[PDB]
Amino acid sequence: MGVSDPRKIVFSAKIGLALTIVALLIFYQEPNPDLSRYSVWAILTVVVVFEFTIGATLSKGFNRALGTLSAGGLALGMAELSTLFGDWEEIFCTLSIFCIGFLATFMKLYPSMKAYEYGFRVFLLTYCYILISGFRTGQFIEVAISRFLLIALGAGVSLGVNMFIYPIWAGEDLHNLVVKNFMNVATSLEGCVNGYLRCVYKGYRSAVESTSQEESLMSFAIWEPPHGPYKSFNYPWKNYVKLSGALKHCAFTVMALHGCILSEIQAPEERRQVFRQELQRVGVEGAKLLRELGEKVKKMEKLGPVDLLFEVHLAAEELQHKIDKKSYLLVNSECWKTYESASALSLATFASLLIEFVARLQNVVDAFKELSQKANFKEP
Amino acid sequence: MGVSDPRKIVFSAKIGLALTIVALLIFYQEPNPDLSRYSVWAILTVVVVFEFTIGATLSKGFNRALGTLSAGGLALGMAELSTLFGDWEEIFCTLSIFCIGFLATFMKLYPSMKAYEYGFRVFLLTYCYILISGFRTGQFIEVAISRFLLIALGAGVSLGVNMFIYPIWAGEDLHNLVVKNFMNVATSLEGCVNGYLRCVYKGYRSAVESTSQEESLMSFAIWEPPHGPYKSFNYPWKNYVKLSGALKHCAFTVMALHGCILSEIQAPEERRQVFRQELQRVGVEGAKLLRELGEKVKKMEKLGPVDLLFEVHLAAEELQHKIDKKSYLLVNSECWKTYESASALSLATFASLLIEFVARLQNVVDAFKELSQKANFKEP
Ligand SMILES: CCCCCCCCCCCCCCCCCC(=O)OC[C@H](COP(=O)(O)O)OC(=O)CCCCCCCCCCCCCCCCC
Ligand SMILES: CC(C)CCC[C@@H](C)[C@H]1CC[C@H]2[C@@H]3CC=C4C[C@@H](OC(=O)CCC(=O)O)CC[C@]4(C)[C@H]3CC[C@]12C
Ligand SMILES: CC(C)CCC[C@@H](C)[C@H]1CC[C@H]2[C@@H]3CC=C4C[C@@H](OC(=O)CCC(=O)O)CC[C@]4(C)[C@H]3CC[C@]12C
Ligand SMILES: CC(C)CCC[C@@H](C)[C@H]1CC[C@H]2[C@@H]3CC=C4C[C@@H](OC(=O)CCC(=O)O)CC[C@]4(C)[C@H]3CC[C@]12C
Ligand SMILES: CC(C)CCC[C@@H](C)[C@H]1CC[C@H]2[C@@H]3CC=C4C[C@@H](OC(=O)CCC(=O)O)CC[C@]4(C)[C@H]3CC[C@]12C
Ligand SMILES: CC(C)CCC[C@@H](C)[C@H]1CC[C@H]2[C@@H]3CC=C4C[C@@H](OC(=O)CCC(=O)O)CC[C@]4(C)[C@H]3CC[C@]12C
Ligand SMILES: CC(C)CCC[C@@H](C)[C@H]1CC[C@H]2[C@@H]3CC=C4C[C@@H](OC(=O)CCC(=O)O)CC[C@]4(C)[C@H]3CC[C@]12C
């Protein structure tokens, strides 16, 4: 609330500050009777132009400006091509409204068509207003010019109070998310083993749903200038996305491992207490490796001159040896109820899932090496 | 586009129709010079009051009306308690704007606080306008009354053109979604078995993400009157949600089964070709049962006087017998590389997952029976 995210306390304040500034400006002007009654547009612009991050603000401003200008020009021209049709100037002014409304509503229901929705809305609004009002090219331009000088003040105050007072970036957000994802999967892999051997959802149910957010953060960050520890005009951000994509593949195996614990068919504790010492070592080595990788990502450091996938591999090999030398406790070998014979293969399923998780750890290391190459990570 | 969802072609048209009607109305009035320049509010209301479904429209209208009235009253009173503070009437009018902006921004960043965001926005807008304009209780009420009679026309035309011209309901949407979810999981369970035995994502990746949509549809439907095949003042809709919740539990097992096919460690075809005939029967029986349940839900019919969980159970028992009489091909029993010994337990994992899926099918039947009881399904 007040400690989970300090940024939420600075953004709001910024907003308030902007509003105050606008008010002060309107108070500094002389007693103009037409500068005080059109002040609801500056307030609307001030509260509608703010965005959390710099890249999102920049993209929204660019798109909105282009769409507003295009729609305004086309809607001003299409209400002047309509006064020369002749005597068909009262069925056309009734068919056009219907067609424009239909097109505007149609363009909004399809997610694919989302960059051109705003322009269409602006065109619909402007065209309908000009026709129903009774205005003429000369009587509408004066109103536009009169009520656009209180829109540009709000737009430039909102744009001045965001890029120079505690700027908030998106690349840092992506970096923090990646770190928290390595740490969530490391914190869940231990809890699944402990939950199986004792007689774990927040880490595998946050990494798998964090693809759309990563894509949006990357899209926002591609609209930002060089700053701080990120010095370049083409900074590799898809190499950060690829690492999370690789980690999600392992998080799926952790998902299956947790789901094993929630089945109707379960094995007895006395049969699962034979592999406790073998499972614990893998469950600790995997988490250690994941935390080491997360920390290296956080500090922006290249991998050392020592192999990092040795201890987990040795632990997996030992587990495989123990399984091979104890397989008689998993299947019924005297026939070479069904529930009794099916409750013993759960251990085999769990061990196979753990081995699959261990084997899926090379792609993460490969992605990290590639990222460190393209981003110029400092030597250890 | 034009055939995937016919409703998308009727809604838009409705919108256009509403707009046309409004235009016609404004044209029917005499040449009023103040009834034509305030016509951008009726258009804004017309395009802002439309919703796809009836329940969503009703809920939004209720919430917006209450919040608008509350905020308008409080913002009219708080700009009249401010002219009696005395000589501290110019630092208070600067501190209040900042505080109000801070509070409005704070109330928006928290998803929990979402029913009271609109009222706060309205209060902020009204208070800031009254202060910066220079208005008095008597000079603002006249403007409000003048520009609210073109807002109520748009609101009642949008509300009249939606509830009586091709009404669209949400309960039908929930019903169709449930049916398509039973059919997606039935279409994926077959493709996972065929993909494993040959030498399947749309059905298990649509059911698991359809919980928020079901909750929203249920919330919207609780705001609708009796109609058609749904005749009651308290219609059980959470009993429809519970069935999908039960089916998702099995869809997770189908997820694991599909994920088995995408592992680095795979078994040889010659070893997996021994259980083909046993796996095919279960893969067909499960889909048949799921499709039977989906069809019964679609037609609103009670279950017959014959057990529906017999064939799948018999198939699972046969698979368990075959596994018990062929287990020597899964493990190395001569020690009572690691990859060779670990590539043979994949069959055991797949069979265990399939048996778990088969066992998780009683909860779905139980939920369907309960729903048919509370919803009064017709006898077969
Ligand atoms: C923001 C409204 C505050 C409360 C207003 C009191 C109720 C008045 C009744 C009349 C209805 C007018 C308010 C309806 C607003 C439309 C809702 C909406 O879709 O907006 C998105 C968005 C609301 O979406 P939401 O966040 O999901 O609630 O913002 C708005 O509410 C209105 C945004 C318009 C402000 C732009 C003004 C800047 C000057 C130049 C404008 C040129 C473009 C004009 C086209 C703007 C299209 C909106
Ligand atoms: C002609 C150029 C060289 C100088 C002037 C450019 C302006 C015409 C542009 C710059 C930023 C634009 C604004 C960018 C963002 C918005 C908010 C935008 O917000 C919405 O569209 C509603 C909310 C939403 O859609 O999310 C409404 C128009 C507006 C004020 C734009 C109006 C036109 C502005 C002032
Ligand atoms: C309705 C008929 C009779 C007249 C034509 C309707 C126009 C209002 C449409 C047609 C083309 C549209 C434009 C098509 C291309 C663009 C560029 C487009 O580029 C982007 O996508 C910006 C970057 C991004 O955000 O992805 C921004 C909006 C805009 C100007 C659109 C605004 C609305 C326009 C002018
Ligand atoms: C080449 C140019 C023409 C492109 C950019 C034009 C825009 C700046 C236009 C498009 C729509 C115009 C707006 C259209 C509708 C209105 C509302 C209109 O509202 C009223 O009805 C005033 C009277 C009242 O509300 O009582 C006042 C002007 C204004 C804000 C206009 C301001 C200028 C806008 C944003
Ligand atoms: C006093 C009672 C007995 C009769 C009059 C009630 C009206 C004051 C209510 C009924 C419906 C209300 C409208 C309901 C829906 C909207 C759309 C609403 O949309 C938005 O809030 C912007 C878009 C969004 O937030 O999604 C803006 C106010 C408005 C027009 C409301 C204005 C107040 C209205 C007309
Ligand atoms: C800022 C300070 C100095 C003055 C008080 C601010 C008000 C504008 C707040 C305080 C209580 C708020 C109200 C609290 C309770 C409700 C009922 C609330 O009920 C619902 O939740 C409707 C059903 C739903 O959609 O869930 C609808 C909005 C409203 C009137 C809120 C509108 C905004 C209010 C009046
Ligand atoms: C007990 C009552 C007072 C509760 C309901 C009051 C609402 C109907 C009020 C709240 C805010 C009011 C609006 C406040 C701001 C405006 C914009 C204002 O815009 C102008 O600045 C007109 C001149 C111009 O735009 O050039 C015109 C009146 C209007 C729509 C008001 C219409 C009536 C509203 C919606």
- Three-state secondary structure along A24-84? HHHHHCCCCCCCCCCCHHHHHHHHHCCCCCHHHHHHHHHHHHHHHHHHHHHHHHHCCCCCC
Return residues 69-108 of A near B (CB < 8 Å).
Answer: 94, 97-102, 104-106
User: What is the gyration radius of the CA atoms in chain B, in angstroms?
Assistant: 31
Q: Phi and psi (nearest 5°) for A265?
A: -95, 115
Three-state DSSP class for A226? coil
3-class DSSP string for chain B: CCCCCCHHHHHHHHHHHHHHHHHHHHHHCCCCCCCCCCCHHHHHHHHHCCCCCHHHHHHHHHHHHHHHHHHHHHHHHHCCCCCCCCCCCCCHHHHHHHHHHHHHHHHHCCCCCCCCHHHHHHHHHHHHHHHHHCCCHHHHHHHHHHCCCCHHHHHHHHHHCCCCCCCCCCHHHHHHHHHHHHHHHHHHHHHHHHHHHCCCCCCCCCCCCCCHHHHHHHHHHCCCCCECCECCCCCCCHHHHHHHHHHHHHHHHHHHHHHHCCCCCCCCHHHHCCCHHHHHHHHHHHHHHHHHHHHHHHHCECCCCCCCCCHHHHHHHHHHHHHHCCHHHCCCCCCCCHHHHHCCCHHHHHHHHHHHHHHCCHHHHHHHHHHHHHHCCECC
Return residues 188-207 of A near B (CB < 8 Å).
Answer: none
User: What gap in Å lies between CA B236 and CA A243, rounded to an integer?
Assistant: 46
- The nearest CA of chain B is from the CA of A375 a distance in Å of 29
Return residues 119-138 of A near B (CB < 8 Å).
Answer: 121, 124-125, 128-129, 131-134
What the block records as the tokens of A55 is 């890249």
| Chain B hits for A89, Cβ within 8 Å | none
What the block records as the tokens of A318 is 């030992």
Q: Phi and psi (nearest 5°) for B53?
A: -110, 165
H helices present in chain A, as ranges: 7-28, 40-48, 54-78, 92-108, 117-133, 137-146, 151-160, 171-197, 212-221, 238-260, 269-272, 276-299, 311-324, 338-342, 346-359, 362-375
How many CA atoms does the CB half-sphere of B158 hold within 13 Å?
25
**Interchain proximity B341–A349, CB inside 8 Å:** no
> Which residue, A296, A260, A278, A261, is CA-closest to A183?
A296
> Which residue, B280, B297, B281, B282, is CA-closest to B182?
B297
User: What gap in Å lies between CA B195 and CA B259, rounded to an integer?
Assistant: 11
What the block records as the tokens of B82 is 């401010």
**Interchain proximity B16–A124, CB inside 8 Å:** no
| Chain B hits for A345, Cβ within 8 Å | 348, 351-352
Q: Can you say whether the dihedral through the CA atoms of B16, B18, B24, B30 is positive or negative?
A: negative
What the block records as the tokens of B175 is 């019903």
Closest ligand by atom to B129 CA: 7
> Which residue, A134, A118, A122, is CA-closest to A79?
A134
Closest ligand by atom to B126 CA: 7
Between CA A204 and CA A213, with CA A208 as vertex, the angle to 5 degrees is 130
Alpha-carbon dihedral angle through residues A353, A356, A358, A364, given to the nearest 10 degrees: -130
> Which residue, A352, A255, A274, A362, is CA-closest to A312?
A362
User: What gap in Å lies between CA A46 and CA B128, rounded to an integer?
Assistant: 12
Three-state DSSP class for A87? coil
Find all residues with CB under 8 Å of A148, minimum gap 6, and list them: none
A57: region left, alpha or beta (phi > 0 left; psi from -120 to 50 alpha): alpha
Q: Give the residue on B whose Cα is nearest the Cα of A41.
A: B129
Three-state DSSP class for A131? helix
> Which residue, B312, B327, B324, B221, is CA-closest to B271?
B327
> Which residue, B23, B42, B302, B24, is CA-closest to B147?
B42
Q: Can you say whether the dihedral through the CA atoms of B312, B315, B321, B325 is positive or negative?
A: negative
Three-state DSSP class for A287? helix
**Interchain proximity A16–B99, CB inside 8 Å:** yes
Three-state DSSP class for A227? strand
Experimental method: cryo-EM
For chain B, the straight-line distance linking the first and the last C-alpha, in angstroms and rounded, comes to: 38
Return residues 150-189 of B near A (CB < 8 Å).
Answer: none
What the block records as the tokens of A93 is 């002014």
User: What gap in Å lies between CA A76 and CA B210, rounded to an integer?
Assistant: 45
Three-state DSSP class for A230? strand
Find all residues with CB under 8 Å of B265, minimum gap 6, and list them: A352, A355, A356, A359, B339, B342, B343, B346
Closest ligand by atom to B158 CA: 5
User: What gap in Å lies between CA B304 and CA B318, rounded to an integer?
Assistant: 26
- The nearest CA of chain B is from the CA of A110 a distance in Å of 9
Residue B50 CA, ligand 1 centroid: distance in Å: 14
DSSP class of residue A208? S
Across-strand partners of B230?
B227
Q: By CB neighbour count within 10 A (0-12 exposed, 13-18 middle, 19+ buried), where does B356 fall?
A: buried
User: What gap in Å lies between CA B100 and CA A48, rounded to an integer?
Assistant: 16
For chain A, the straight-line distance linking the first and the last C-alpha, in angstroms and rounded, comes to: 38
Three-state DSSP class for A360? coil
> Which residue, A122, A243, A131, A251, is CA-closest to A186?
A251
Three-state DSSP class for A378? strand
- The nearest CA of chain B is from the CA of A379 a distance in Å of 32
Q: Phi and psi (nearest 5°) for B34?
A: -115, 0
Across-strand partners of A230?
A227
> What are the boundaries of each domain within chain B?
7-160, 171-375
**Interchain proximity B355–A342, CB inside 8 Å:** yes
User: What gap in Å lies between CA B38 and CA B48, rounded to an integer?
Assistant: 16
| CB of A140 closer than 8 Å to CB of A76 | yes
User: What gap in Å lies between CA B234 and CA B222, rounded to an integer?
Assistant: 8
| CB of B247 closer than 8 Å to CB of B255 | no
User: What gap in Å lies between CA A357 and CA A355, rounded to an integer?
Assistant: 5
Q: Phi and psi (nearest 5°) for A227?
A: -165, 145
Largest CA distance in chain B: 102
The angstrom resolution of this structure is 3.0
Residue B159 CA, ligand 1 centroid: distance in Å: 19
CATH architecture of structural domain A171-375: Up-down Bundle (1.20)
